[PDB]
Design a protein around this ligand. Sequence first.
Ligand SMILES: *[C@@H]1O[C@H](CO)[C@@H](O[C@@H]2O[C@H](CO)[C@@H](O[C@@H]3O[C@H](CO[C@H]4O[C@H](CO[C@H]5O[C@H](CO)[C@@H](O)[C@H](O)[C@@H]5O)[C@@H](O)[C@H](O[C@H]5O[C@H](CO)[C@@H](O)[C@H](O)[C@@H]5O)[C@@H]4O)[C@@H](O)[C@H](O[C@H]4O[C@H](CO)[C@@H](O)[C@H](O)[C@@H]4O[C@H]4O[C@H](CO)[C@@H](O)[C@H](O)[C@@H]4O)[C@@H]3O)[C@H](O)[C@H]2NC(C)=O)[C@H](O)[C@H]1NC(C)=O
Ligand SMILES: *[C@@H]1O[C@H](CO)[C@@H](O[C@@H]2O[C@H](CO)[C@@H](O[C@@H]3O[C@H](CO[C@H]4O[C@H](CO[C@H]5O[C@H](CO)[C@@H](O)[C@H](O)[C@@H]5O)[C@@H](O)[C@H](O[C@H]5O[C@H](CO)[C@@H](O)[C@H](O)[C@@H]5O)[C@@H]4O)[C@@H](O)[C@H](O[C@H]4O[C@H](CO)[C@@H](O)[C@H](O)[C@@H]4O)[C@@H]3O)[C@H](O)[C@H]2NC(C)=O)[C@H](O)[C@H]1NC(C)=O
Ligand SMILES: *[C@@H]1O[C@H](CO)[C@@H](O[C@@H]2O[C@H](CO)[C@@H](O[C@@H]3O[C@H](CO[C@H]4O[C@H](CO[C@H]5O[C@H](CO)[C@@H](O)[C@H](O)[C@@H]5O)[C@@H](O)[C@H](O[C@H]5O[C@H](CO)[C@@H](O)[C@H](O)[C@@H]5O)[C@@H]4O)[C@@H](O)[C@H](O)[C@@H]3O)[C@H](O)[C@H]2NC(C)=O)[C@H](O)[C@H]1NC(C)=O
Ligand SMILES: *[C@@H]1O[C@H](CO)[C@@H](O[C@@H]2O[C@H](CO)[C@@H](O[C@@H]3O[C@H](CO[C@H]4O[C@H](CO[C@H]5O[C@H](CO)[C@@H](O)[C@H](O)[C@@H]5O)[C@@H](O)[C@H](O[C@H]5O[C@H](CO)[C@@H](O)[C@H](O)[C@@H]5O)[C@@H]4O)[C@@H](O)[C@H](O)[C@@H]3O)[C@H](O)[C@H]2NC(C)=O)[C@H](O)[C@H]1NC(C)=O
Ligand SMILES: *[C@@H]1O[C@H](CO)[C@@H](O[C@@H]2O[C@H](CO)[C@@H](O)[C@H](O)[C@H]2NC(C)=O)[C@H](O)[C@H]1NC(C)=O
Ligand SMILES: *[C@@H]1O[C@H](CO)[C@@H](O[C@@H]2O[C@H](CO)[C@@H](O)[C@H](O)[C@H]2NC(C)=O)[C@H](O)[C@H]1NC(C)=O
Ligand SMILES: *[C@@H]1O[C@H](CO)[C@@H](O[C@@H]2O[C@H](CO)[C@@H](O)[C@H](O)[C@H]2NC(C)=O)[C@H](O)[C@H]1NC(C)=O
Ligand SMILES: *[C@@H]1O[C@H](CO)[C@@H](O[C@@H]2O[C@H](CO)[C@@H](O)[C@H](O)[C@H]2NC(C)=O)[C@H](O)[C@H]1NC(C)=O
Ligand SMILES: *[C@@H]1O[C@H](CO)[C@@H](O[C@@H]2O[C@H](CO)[C@@H](O)[C@H](O)[C@H]2NC(C)=O)[C@H](O)[C@H]1NC(C)=O
Ligand SMILES: *[C@@H]1O[C@H](CO)[C@@H](O)[C@H](O)[C@H]1NC(C)=O
Ligand SMILES: [Ca+2]
Ligand SMILES: [Ca+2]
Ligand SMILES: [Ca+2]
Ligand SMILES: [Ca+2]
Lengths: 389, 389, 389, 389
Amino acid sequence: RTFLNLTKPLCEVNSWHILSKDNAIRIGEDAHILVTREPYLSCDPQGCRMFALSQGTTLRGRHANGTIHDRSPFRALISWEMGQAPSPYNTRVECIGWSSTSCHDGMSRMSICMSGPNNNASAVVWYGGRPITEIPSWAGNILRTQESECVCHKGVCPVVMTDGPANNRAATKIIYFKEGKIQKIEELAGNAQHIEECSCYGAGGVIKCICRDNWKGANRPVITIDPEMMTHTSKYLCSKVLTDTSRPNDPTNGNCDAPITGGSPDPGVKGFAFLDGENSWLGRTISKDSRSGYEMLKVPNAETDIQSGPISNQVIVNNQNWSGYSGAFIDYWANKECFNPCFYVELIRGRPKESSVLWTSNSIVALCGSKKRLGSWSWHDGAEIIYFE
Amino acid sequence: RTFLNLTKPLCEVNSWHILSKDNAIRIGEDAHILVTREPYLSCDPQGCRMFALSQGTTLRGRHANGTIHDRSPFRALISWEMGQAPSPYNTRVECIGWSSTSCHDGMSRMSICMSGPNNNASAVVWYGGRPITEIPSWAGNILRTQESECVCHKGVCPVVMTDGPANNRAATKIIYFKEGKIQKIEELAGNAQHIEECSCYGAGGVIKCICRDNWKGANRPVITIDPEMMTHTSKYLCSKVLTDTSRPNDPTNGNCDAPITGGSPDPGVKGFAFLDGENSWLGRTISKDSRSGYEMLKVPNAETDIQSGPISNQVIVNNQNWSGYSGAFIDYWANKECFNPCFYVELIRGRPKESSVLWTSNSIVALCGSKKRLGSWSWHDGAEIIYFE
Amino acid sequence: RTFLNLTKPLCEVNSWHILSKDNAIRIGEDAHILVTREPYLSCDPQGCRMFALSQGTTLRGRHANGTIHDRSPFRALISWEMGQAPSPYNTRVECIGWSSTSCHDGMSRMSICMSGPNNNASAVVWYGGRPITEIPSWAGNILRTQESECVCHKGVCPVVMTDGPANNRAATKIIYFKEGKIQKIEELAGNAQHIEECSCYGAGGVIKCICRDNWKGANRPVITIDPEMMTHTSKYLCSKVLTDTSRPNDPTNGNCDAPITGGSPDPGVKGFAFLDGENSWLGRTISKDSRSGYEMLKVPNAETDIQSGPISNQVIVNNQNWSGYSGAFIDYWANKECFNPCFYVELIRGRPKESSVLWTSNSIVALCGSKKRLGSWSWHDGAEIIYFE
Amino acid sequence: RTFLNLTKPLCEVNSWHILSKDNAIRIGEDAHILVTREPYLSCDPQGCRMFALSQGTTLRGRHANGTIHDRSPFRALISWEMGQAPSPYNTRVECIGWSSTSCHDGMSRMSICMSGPNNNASAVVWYGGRPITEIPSWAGNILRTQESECVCHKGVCPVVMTDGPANNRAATKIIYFKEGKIQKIEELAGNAQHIEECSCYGAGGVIKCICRDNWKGANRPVITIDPEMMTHTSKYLCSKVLTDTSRPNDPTNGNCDAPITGGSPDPGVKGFAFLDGENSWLGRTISKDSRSGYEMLKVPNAETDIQSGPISNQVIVNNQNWSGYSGAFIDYWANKECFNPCFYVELIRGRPKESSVLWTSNSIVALCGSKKRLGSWSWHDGAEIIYFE
Ligand SMILES: *[C@@H]1O[C@H](CO)[C@@H](O[C@@H]2O[C@H](CO)[C@@H](O[C@@H]3O[C@H](CO[C@H]4O[C@H](CO[C@H]5O[C@H](CO)[C@@H](O)[C@H](O)[C@@H]5O)[C@@H](O)[C@H](O[C@H]5O[C@H](CO)[C@@H](O)[C@H](O)[C@@H]5O)[C@@H]4O)[C@@H](O)[C@H](O[C@H]4O[C@H](CO)[C@@H](O)[C@H](O)[C@@H]4O[C@H]4O[C@H](CO)[C@@H](O)[C@H](O)[C@@H]4O)[C@@H]3O)[C@H](O)[C@H]2NC(C)=O)[C@H](O)[C@H]1NC(C)=O
Ligand SMILES: *[C@@H]1O[C@H](CO)[C@@H](O[C@@H]2O[C@H](CO)[C@@H](O[C@@H]3O[C@H](CO[C@H]4O[C@H](CO[C@H]5O[C@H](CO)[C@@H](O)[C@H](O)[C@@H]5O)[C@@H](O)[C@H](O[C@H]5O[C@H](CO)[C@@H](O)[C@H](O)[C@@H]5O)[C@@H]4O)[C@@H](O)[C@H](O[C@H]4O[C@H](CO)[C@@H](O)[C@H](O)[C@@H]4O)[C@@H]3O)[C@H](O)[C@H]2NC(C)=O)[C@H](O)[C@H]1NC(C)=O
Ligand SMILES: *[C@@H]1O[C@H](CO)[C@@H](O[C@@H]2O[C@H](CO)[C@@H](O[C@@H]3O[C@H](CO[C@H]4O[C@H](CO[C@H]5O[C@H](CO)[C@@H](O)[C@H](O)[C@@H]5O)[C@@H](O)[C@H](O[C@H]5O[C@H](CO)[C@@H](O)[C@H](O)[C@@H]5O)[C@@H]4O)[C@@H](O)[C@H](O)[C@@H]3O)[C@H](O)[C@H]2NC(C)=O)[C@H](O)[C@H]1NC(C)=O
Ligand SMILES: *[C@@H]1O[C@H](CO)[C@@H](O[C@@H]2O[C@H](CO)[C@@H](O[C@@H]3O[C@H](CO[C@H]4O[C@H](CO[C@H]5O[C@H](CO)[C@@H](O)[C@H](O)[C@@H]5O)[C@@H](O)[C@H](O[C@H]5O[C@H](CO)[C@@H](O)[C@H](O)[C@@H]5O)[C@@H]4O)[C@@H](O)[C@H](O)[C@@H]3O)[C@H](O)[C@H]2NC(C)=O)[C@H](O)[C@H]1NC(C)=O
Ligand SMILES: *[C@@H]1O[C@H](CO)[C@@H](O[C@@H]2O[C@H](CO)[C@@H](O)[C@H](O)[C@H]2NC(C)=O)[C@H](O)[C@H]1NC(C)=O
Ligand SMILES: *[C@@H]1O[C@H](CO)[C@@H](O[C@@H]2O[C@H](CO)[C@@H](O)[C@H](O)[C@H]2NC(C)=O)[C@H](O)[C@H]1NC(C)=O
Ligand SMILES: *[C@@H]1O[C@H](CO)[C@@H](O[C@@H]2O[C@H](CO)[C@@H](O)[C@H](O)[C@H]2NC(C)=O)[C@H](O)[C@H]1NC(C)=O
Ligand SMILES: *[C@@H]1O[C@H](CO)[C@@H](O[C@@H]2O[C@H](CO)[C@@H](O)[C@H](O)[C@H]2NC(C)=O)[C@H](O)[C@H]1NC(C)=O
Ligand SMILES: *[C@@H]1O[C@H](CO)[C@@H](O[C@@H]2O[C@H](CO)[C@@H](O)[C@H](O)[C@H]2NC(C)=O)[C@H](O)[C@H]1NC(C)=O
Ligand SMILES: *[C@@H]1O[C@H](CO)[C@@H](O)[C@H](O)[C@H]1NC(C)=O
Ligand SMILES: [Ca+2]
Ligand SMILES: [Ca+2]
Ligand SMILES: [Ca+2]
Ligand SMILES: [Ca+2]
């Protein structure tokens, strides 16, 4: 048992294989399944787990009514064995609140949750199942974090947090933890103008976080973090293949150093990419407008070339089915010479897109890279909304 | 691996951070959640667990009818992983009965339950999951104990017990256990006139128990225990800030050595305080009359100064919501140089305050100290009683 | 870690303290609780567990209809953590069948289940969770065994089994196992005329089995086993205090060497006693006729004195409540210089005594000896049959 | 802990003892039990587990409607403790998809699942709970595998897979894995004309797979694999006792090297045999037309003699009850000098044979060899379909 070091490069990825699916809404139609949203996965030396923010109610429960609402005192980060659906019986409460991240440093798991009212939220930082550090809101406006896993190197686990407006300049910080204790705090530097919901992964001693600009950009901000020097830079994804939602049509050229405006009607969604020269993959919703469908696009030099476009594609969720947030994770403890990219897609069901029920929840699908050329189908949620009416 | 020794001082506390919330009533509206009351938490080298007295029925079950009643042969002390709701599937039966305490001595857990008829109750003392000692009623009138954790030092774990009237002088004893075996029994001495439901914690080699005087005082009794000499003293919290329920208005001065009487309509509720000079915090219900709301008040020198008043406050449960019992615990095994105060509030739902249902149950919230100035919100139970009608 | 040796004497017993109660029928009115009967408890170095024969249906399930029937292909021996109720989610399947015993030898657990048709049943003998031995019926008429725990000494676990009529002479054998393998088989010898459902315990290198004579006696047969020599003797309890059900009134004198006959309308019930000279306790139903109530009677010299009567009594279940089978077990791994007697009472609900429901099931209560004089109350099942109508 | 090798002979078998039965459909009438089909068992050093393909819904759930369908994105291979019924709360997701195999090599478990559309399926090969290898469809027509356990020798675990028509010549391959990595791929050789759903076991350093010819043969193909040389041969079972369903009446002679045509209306079912000279047992449905009943027949020299007929029988499921798939497994880690044959029968309930419900699911029974002459009875599912109407 030892601290994870980010000593490996990313594996070559030519297609995506199925890792896990929990079928939570199908199962939750009859079994005692918690209402969730903002799911993710995170691994440790022993295996991988599913994570999400509970709403503190089952899906068929009367208290599912009103679960469109993002923030309440009844939310908590919960984790469970990958592939099961989240029930009150198989879930571990990681921390209490309505925004989270989690990661394993090789020794123990750090989990962070924000809670409180909009103007006075706070984070509690847990390590090894115990509370270590507390962080008060610095801007008084929904202190919040990644909603997917953080990444650790030599015990140092950077986390990106934001406090301030969703629709204007906000105060983003990079906090570097070790065993749950703050080693350093940096204010966001560089050319990213707005940061939400970073999706992060590590390779070759570098952590890259692909985020959501909720203010201006339909191109995604990219934060590049050195966990040894505990320093960073920021800019935007260069590619013309825009990957936030909502977004306009892809332009003839991207923009590395400024947000590309447009899209309607949504200011953003959490998403991700793996950036590795030729071996670069962008996720996005198939719909330009709404959280519908999900596709993976291989976009060589997306990080550096404004003219970069796709050379291959894999549909993950067809555009007749609802998607949601998406994020990066890696099983850093696999028995491989390279770190293999993985991602999840949150499959949102109910409100607001499906108004015939009173609730909002999700299920999860996760995939990882293959070097092979694998066939694919749509991994949509699979529940029949009419059964809940 | 070794006995806990209470070597460390209390941590400085300037505000309270969220630790856990189980949302039991919300979840139990649909899932199979046991009816409980008199909850608490207690930790050990590996972590913390929730505890409560089951009523031997689920909340939606027909047997939840009648659960306002305190004592039956169907009650048991159960424990479960912190943050989960208590189901028939995830709970450990610690012992059988209708009054309890539990604590870990660093080696194993001691749990104690009283059971039987009012005039012929008995305690069974468990250690490491096995029954060790039994104690018959000495006064033939509801032998009973703390309803929150005990505290251990060098393997010696004092427990405060009462047998006798709830509304007149009773027979309290302090029993000092080691590995579940009685080392010494003392009769209550000093100026406290009636003792119930002690909330106890340890720091700097001293155990302090903040109790309920059900006979006279709206100020709370304090028993100070030397766990090495196995002796004690008792008196009242000195502060004018009265912290029982029901209580009168706070007087000009409190009284260290006698009860401050008054209030209506109820003679008491279990509560707690942390007493450490300037670093002193008193919990109480927001209402003077009813078990509604919950507030933490920083009252420097509350233990010693009859003129001591609050210098800061944090609302835990707003006064539009039901509270209940409250009690102390500490994660004595944290990786900190001090022992950090924690507490829980029982959030009672149903009878008698909510008579539209046939049951009485609760959920739990728990918080611990922070040296930071954290923002706060209300951690009320969150269930809609109309859903249960 | 080491084979159990039955070195220790029995502890002095002056009253009985509560050990466990599962409240299964109360809980199972709403939660998913298996239908059972023929429960018992059995301990091991780590803890104690509850055992019973499942009916392969939940209590509220439609397949609970018809569960008065004793033998089907849908029964199995299940175990679970002591104090929980048996659900499909918390139970281990020990073996498949409709008659059972189980014991731990200090290293691993031996479990035995008989299954098959009446004329051609077979036992499968499991050790450490694997099947070791199979035993075909020797008399073609419901091969069957203890329905409570067996006892082990230096790795040898004797088990009493019967094959043959329930209402005439049958063929009983004592089979001596080690690691699930047959070391020796003996035909029953001595003065017991019929043997069913032995309740066995060890002390001072001797195993005593207190059984049910279903053919003649309302006095209980006693088999005394030497597990080192692998030999035995049999006779009847001497005491005039008759402990089977149905039974006649206690006569002036019992009979050590022949059945005391009579009683109406039923030929027997599984029960138990602890026999240790002056330190002897007999359990029985309070009703002479029906499986109603339960009482413990201290009967000095019950094993040797035909005139021995009770000097003490403790009501375990009041005579307004249903009881059932009862049996012996001991935590042989307690940290005590003596082995402390324990017993359970099966609390049968439903048919045939409560014919307003279509099912038969039970809950469990268990108690162990105290040297103190503890108060007592009735530990009846506690479910309202009306809720099941 | 070492790699398993197969250098023990098969135990002598004269009858079959009950190993496990989950009663899933009875329990699932009113507990949260997943809809499954294609079950099996597989063992490891610690014990044995049940496996099946979930349909990603509970049995009583509305999504159970339409579970006759074999392939969907909502299916997964799940495993659970032997004898329990499969719930969302007690099941481990081994991999995602709609055809599987699994086996333990002595060190870790390999699990394989195929998923995707009919024309573009792919296998993901897991080892020790992590994805190792992916395999694309080679024939574009439902890449698929055994639906019962594989077998490992000195690290090498062969797996039989088919891709191609169910009703014409297909492309079968034997893939040899070590720690989930491909060691070798072979195309099917020999005289078997079509291969589905192989049931495999090892003995004497050889793996024998008894399979389903879905194209022509009512006699079952037999593939003999040497896991050291990593080569194989194939032919048909010689015996005149035909063991596929549907099948004609048994002829006066079998055929070792060609399919025997006939039977109506169905082309095949997964089944199994143990082939060991005089010690040979064949399973089959009792009905020659339908998946009803199940019988074991001892057919000396079934593998080599076209005139070989039964010398003994045991009815496992009576012919008034539904059966289904059946397959081989062995506890290779038992404490015996020989490998004892075990098998399971899938007990299918619902569609198409029971059209009064909207679903298709199963329960499991499993039996192992005995050298004794044990009595038998029918181990049918035991649910009443009307309870589901
Ligand atoms: C088994 O399953 C596997 C796994 O899924 C399947 O393999 C897959 O096979 C397909 C072909 O069948 C390959 O498709 C290739 O994808 C790339 C990239 O495509 C993405 O980007 C395109 C451009 O997008 C930008 O630009 C457009 C405007 O131009 C904007 O609208 C966009 O917003 C972007 O800004 C885009 O058009 C593609 O859309 C398609 O996919 C999406 C999902 O992402 C769908 O929703 C759409 O409906 C649509 O289908 C996509 O987003 C293309 O570049 C490839 O085109 C080349 O190849 C074609 C032949 O395959 C050929 O007709 C084209 O003219 C073009 O040819 C050029 O390049 C070839 C090399 O690729 C040369 O050979 C050729 O000579 C020439 O120079 C192609 O469309 C998948 O990548 C592949 N995936 C994997 C993971 O292997 C397989 O099909 C399955 N088999 C069966 C039997 O089902
Ligand atoms: C207590 O338990 C023990 C142990 O379980 C049990 O022991 C069994 O005892 C019986 C004797 O009572 C044994 O039965 C023997 O079985 C031999 C094989 O029988 C099978 O094969 C027969 C031939 O099948 C082929 O040929 C026919 C055409 O001829 C064709 O239809 C078939 O398809 C196939 O090609 C078959 O007829 C027979 O069918 C019976 O069983 C099936 C289920 O398998 C059932 O569906 C049928 O309705 C029918 O019952 C069977 O499938 C058989 O050869 C053997 O008979 C020879 O010896 C007997 C002596 O008893 C002579 O009378 C006779 O002339 C034969 O030469 C005999 O019938 C069985 O093997 C024991 N099993 C074991 C596991 O030990 C006891 O019976 C139980 N006791 C009680 C009280 O119940
Ligand atoms: C982010 O959240 C922070 C954490 O909660 C919050 O920081 C808080 O800031 C407030 C506002 O500045 C501070 O308030 C200060 O509190 C002290 C102490 O107040 C308490 O005691 C007094 C006196 O009570 C006694 O006397 C009266 C009779 O005069 C009796 O009625 C009473 O029984 C006692 O005998 C009391 O008057 C106060 O009453 C307030 O609070 C209670 C709840 O506890 C309410 O029910 C009541 O209606 C009223 O609101 C109180 O009980 C006071 O002396 C100061 O003058 C000042 O009010 C908090 O202490 C401070 N807390 C912490 C932990 O830092 C931030 O404000 C917040 N930020 C934003 C933007 O929201
Ligand atoms: C706190 O709880 C304590 C624990 O329960 C309790 O202490 C108990 O106190 C009582 C009252 O002092 C003591 O009772 C004594 O018991 C002995 C033994 O009595 C038992 O056996 C006799 C004889 O039965 C045989 O002979 C008769 C002939 O008539 C036959 O019927 C019978 O079949 C036998 O052949 C029997 O008469 C007694 O009957 C009583 O109890 C049964 C239940 O067991 C009832 O069903 C029945 O109606 C009747 O009440 C009994 O079975 C007796 O000889 C003494 O004279 C005296 O009765 C308990 O022994 C004692 N127990 C212990 C464990 O210490 C405290 O009383 C309680 N305190 C308070 C305040 O409640
Ligand atoms: C990751 O790196 C840290 C730092 O290199 C490792 O901790 C080291 O422990 C080994 C023990 O021999 C030494 O090689 C290093 O000098 C240690 N360095 C420090 C500063 O502690 C950790 O072991 C590494 N993890 C892995 C998997 O190799
Ligand atoms: C869903 O939640 C809404 C919001 O609470 C419920 O609307 C309330 O219904 C109650 C009882 O009828 C009324 O007293 C309130 O006036 C309503 N509140 C609001 C804000 O409308 C609604 O009933 C819930 N739906 C269901 C089916 O439970
Ligand atoms: C309980 O089980 C009994 C026995 O199976 C059921 O009674 C049978 O019902 C069938 C079908 O309607 C009748 O034709 C049989 O003749 C009945 N048998 C007997 C012995 O009465 C009964 O319906 C079941 N009850 C419930 C509520 O499920
Ligand atoms: C097959 O596995 C068995 C069991 O591990 C191996 O058994 C050992 O055989 C050697 C001689 O080759 C003995 O010295 C060991 O004591 C045996 N161990 C046991 C537990 O029996 C055997 O070697 C293996 N054979 C191969 C070819 O791998
Ligand atoms: C079971 O599923 C079937 C198949 O989806 C349902 O039948 C369909 O109902 C839809 C919606 O009303 C109709 O438009 C179609 O005509 C039906 N399709 C088919 C193939 O029949 C059926 O209603 C479902 N039953 C239940 C009780 O859920
Ligand atoms: C039990 O008996 C053995 C003899 O078989 C003896 O050596 C040992 O001391 C005893 N074991 C224990 C646990 O006392
Ligand atoms: Ca945006
Ligand atoms: Ca009071
Ligand atoms: Ca009798
Ligand atoms: Ca065929």
